Amino acid sequence: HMASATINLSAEKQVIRGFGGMNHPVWISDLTPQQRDTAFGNGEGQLGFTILRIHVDENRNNWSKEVATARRAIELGAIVSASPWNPPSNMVETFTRNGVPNQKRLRYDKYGDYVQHLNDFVAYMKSNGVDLYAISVQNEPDYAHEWTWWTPQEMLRFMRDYAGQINCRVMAPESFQYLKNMSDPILNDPQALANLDILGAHFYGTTVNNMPYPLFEQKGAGKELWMTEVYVPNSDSNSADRWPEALEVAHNMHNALVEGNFQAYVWWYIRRSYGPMKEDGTISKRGYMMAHYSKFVRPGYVRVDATKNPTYNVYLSACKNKKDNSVVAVVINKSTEAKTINISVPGTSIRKWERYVTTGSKNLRKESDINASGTTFQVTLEPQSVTTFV
Numbered sequence: 001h002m003a004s005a006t007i008n009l010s011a012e013k014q015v016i017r018g019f020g021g022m023n024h025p026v027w028i029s030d031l032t033p034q035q036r037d038t039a040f041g042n043g044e045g046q047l048g049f050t051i052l053r054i055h056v057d058e059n060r061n062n063w064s065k066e067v068a069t070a071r072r073a074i075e076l077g078a079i080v081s082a083s084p085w086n087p088p089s090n091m092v093e094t095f096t097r098n099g100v101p102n103q104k105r106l107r108y109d110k111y112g113d114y115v116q117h118l119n120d121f122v123a124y125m126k127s128n129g130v131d132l133y134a135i136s137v138q139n140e141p142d143y144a145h146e147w148t149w150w151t152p153q154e155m156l157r158f159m160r161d162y163a164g165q166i167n168c169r170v171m172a173p174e175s176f177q178y179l180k181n182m183s184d185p186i187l188n189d190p191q192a193l194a195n196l197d198i199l200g201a202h203f204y205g206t207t208v209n210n211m212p213y214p215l216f217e218q219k220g221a222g223k224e225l226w227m228t229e230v231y232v233p234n235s236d237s238n239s240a241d242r243w244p245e246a247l248e249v250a251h252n253m254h255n256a257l258v259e260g261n262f263q264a265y266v267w268w269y270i271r272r273s274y275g276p277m278k279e280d281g282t283i284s285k286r287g288y289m290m291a292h293y294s295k296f297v298r299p300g301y302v303r304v305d306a307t308k309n310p311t312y313n314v315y316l317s318a319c320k321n322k323k324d325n326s327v328v329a330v331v332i333n334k335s336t337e338a339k340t341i342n343i344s345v346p347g348t349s350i351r352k353w354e355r356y357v358t359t360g361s362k363n364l365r366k367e368s369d370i371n372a373s374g375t376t377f378q379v380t381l382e383p384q385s386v387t388t389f390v
C-alpha cells in the first residue's frame with residue numbers, strides 16, 4: 001500500500017522554456033485587457049503563462065491587430081513566437097494533392113519573397129515593442145487542406161537555402177502530429193540544421209510511443225524543442241470544465257515533458273469553451289491542469305530524472321530551480337483510490353513541501369505541508385487529482 005519514487009536532482013534533463021497558448025484576433029476575438037493579465041500574470045486566479053503564440057497574417061494590414069496582446073504578454077514576462085498559415089496570395093500557386101485539386105503551396109520562385117515577408121513581420125513587431133522569440137516557416141505543412149502545404153523536401157530547401165536570411169530564431173516544421181518525416185531532412189542536413197533554432201511540433205493524435213525523437217537527441221545540440229499547439233482530448237463545445245476528462249490535459253503535459261523532453265507546451269486558443277480560459281474570463285478545469293505546471297515550473301528550471309509512473313494511474317515529473325536546488329514535483333493521480341507515495345529526494349537539504357491540489361471539487365487548493373523524514377517526502381494523492389509540490 002506504499003508506492004515509492006525517487007527524484008534525482010543530479011540527473012538534469014531539458015531546460016524549461018515555458019507554457020502558454022494562442023491568441024488570434026483575426027479568426028476570433030482578441031484577449032481583453034483583463035484576460036491578458038489573467039493569462040500572463042502569475043497571481044492567484046491567473047494562469048501564469050510564459051509563452052504567447054500568434055499568427056503571421058498573409059495580409060500585412062492585419063498585423064497591427066496582434067500588437068496589444070503581444071506587448072502585454074512581454075511586459076508580464078512572456079516570450080512570443082509567431083507562425084504563418086499562408087504566404088501572401090501573390091506568392092501562392094496551386095496543385096493537385098492525392099487527387100484533390102486547388103491545393104496551395106508557396107511558389108518555388110517566391111522563396112526569397114517569403115523570407116522578406118517573414119522579415120517584414122519581424123521588423124514591424126520589433127518597431128511596435130514586440131521582439132519575437134522565434135518565427136516559424138509554416139503552421140502544419142503536413143495538414144494543410146485549409147492552408148499552405150509543404151513537402152519534407154520543400155521545407156528542407158527553405159531551411160537550407162533561405163532560412164539563414166531570417167532576422168529571428170527560426171522554428172520548423174510544426175507537423176500536426178510530430179511526424180518525423182517532416183523534420184528528419186532538416187536534422188540530417190548540416191546547413192538546414194544550422195539555420196534551425198527551434199524544432200516545433202504539434203501533438204494532435206501523437207501517442208506516447210511517438211514522443212521520443214532519437215535523431216533530435218543525436219543531432220539537436222543547441223536547438224530548442226517546443227510543442228507549439230494542441231488541444232486535448234477534444235475541442236468539444238463547453239467541455240473545459242468536464243471532469244475527470246480534464247485530467248487528460250495534465251497527462252498530455254506530463255507526457256510532453258517526460259516522454260518527449262519538450263521545453264515548451266503551448267495550447268491552441270487561450271480563451272475558448274474548450275480552452276484554459278472560459279469565455280467568461282475565468283480559468284477552466286483544463287486551465288487549472290495547465291496551471292499546475294505553468295504557475296510553478298518557471299522558465300529556466302530544469303527537468304530532472306524522477307520515477308515517472310510509480311504506481312498504476314500515478315504520473316510524476318520533477319523540475320529543479322538551479323538558483324537554490326529547490327524542486328517542483330507535479331503528480332497526477334487518475335485512480336479512483338487515493339495513493340500514498342514515499343518520494344525519496346536523496347541529497348536535498350529541503351525538509352518541507354507546500355502543496356496545491358485540484359480535483360473535481362476544488363482548484364489549486366493549498367493543503368497541509370509535507371514534512372520530510374530525512375530525504376523522504378511521504379505524500380498522499382487524492383483520487384482523480386493533480387498536486388503540485390513546491
Ligand SMILES: C[C@@H](O)[C@H](N)C(=O)O
Pocket residue numbers: 337
Ligand atoms: C478491489 C477493489 O474493491 C478495492 N477494494 C478498491 O480499492 O477499490
